[PDB]
């Protein structure tokens, strides 16, 4: 019933650099529910596991408003209503490491895909 491109994913970027996370949800006359996007992160290095950091609901893109990863996990899509729910992480870092879950909620089709953020070693940057 649902349709999502690149579900399970792994992204590796240099610390301090922005890590792009692509999410493309399919559109259909059926998807009459409000457009929604969600991102959970589980830091392998940190004690944290599965926590909300960036979301997009009610036309409000949440990332900077969200304490978790505020100011970084920014949707590169300036027109998410086009099916693009992608968010990139600004100013990467070692603690940013951790599995990411991209879930686009749009009735009657909830989209969910995996994105693992891996940070390569490089100068501070953060």
Swiss-Prot record:
GO MF, one annotated term: cell adhesive protein binding involved in AV node cell-bundle of His cell communication
GO cellular component, as recorded: acrosomal vesicle; adherens junction; apicolateral plasma membrane; basolateral plasma membrane; bicellular tight junction; cell body; cell junction; cell-cell junction
Ranges in coiled-coil conformation: none
Disulfide-bonded cysteines: 23-102
One GO biological process term: AV node cell to bundle of His cell communication
Domain of life: Eukaryota
Post-translational modification (record): N-glycosylated.
Residue positions the entry lists as glycosylated: 88
Tissue spec. comment: Expressed in pancreas, brain, heart, small intestine, testis, prostate and at a lower level in liver and lung. Isoform 5 is ubiquitously expressed. Isoform 3 is expressed in heart, lung and pancreas. In skeletal muscle, isoform 1 is found at the neuromuscular junction and isoform 2 is found in blood vessels. In cardiac muscle, isoform 1 and isoform 2 are found at intercalated disks. In heart expressed in subendothelial layers of the vessel wall but not in the luminal endothelial surface. Expression is elevated in hearts with dilated cardiomyopathy.
Keywords of the record: Cell adhesion, Cell junction, Cell membrane, Disulfide bond, Glycoprotein, Host cell receptor for virus entry, Host-virus interaction, Immunoglobulin domain, Lipoprotein, Membrane, Palmitate, Phosphoprotein, Receptor, Repeat, Secreted, Signal, Tight junction, Transmembrane, Transmembrane helix
Ranges for domain Ig-like C2-type: 3-116
Record's comment describing the protein's domains: The Ig-like C2-type 1 domain mediates homodimerization and interaction with JAML.
Complex formation: Monomer. May form homodimer. Interacts with LNX, MAGI1, DLG4, PRKCABP, TJP1 and CTNNB1. Interacts with MPDZ; recruits MPDZ to intercellular contact sites. Interacts with JAML (homodimeric form). Secreted isoform 3, isoform 4 and isoform 5 can interact with the extracellular domain of the receptor.
Biological role: Component of the epithelial apical junction complex that may function as a homophilic cell adhesion molecule and is essential for tight junction integrity. Also involved in transepithelial migration of leukocytes through adhesive interactions with JAML a transmembrane protein of the plasma membrane of leukocytes. The interaction between both receptors also mediates the activation of gamma-delta T-cells, a subpopulation of T-cells residing in epithelia and involved in tissue homeostasis and repair.
Name of the protein this chain belongs to: Coxsackievirus and adenovirus receptor
Organism per entry: Homo sapiens (Human)
């Amino acid at each position: 019933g649902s349709s999502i491109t690149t579900p399970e994913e792994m992204i590796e970027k240099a610390k301090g650099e922005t890590a792009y996370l692509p999410c493309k949800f399919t559109l259909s006359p059926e998807d009459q529910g409000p457009l929604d996007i969600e991102w959970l992160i589980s830091p392998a290095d940190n004690q944290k596991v599965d926590q909300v950091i960036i979301l997009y609901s009610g036309d409000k893109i949440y990332d900077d408003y969200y304490p978790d990863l505020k100011g970084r996990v920014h949707f590169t899509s300036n027109d998410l209503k086009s099916g693009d729910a992608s968010i990139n992480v600004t100013n990467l870092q070692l603690s940013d490491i951790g599995t990411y879950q991209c879930k686009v909620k749009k009735a009657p089709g909830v989209a969910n895909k995996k994105i693992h953020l891996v940070v390569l070693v490089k100068p501070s940057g953060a």
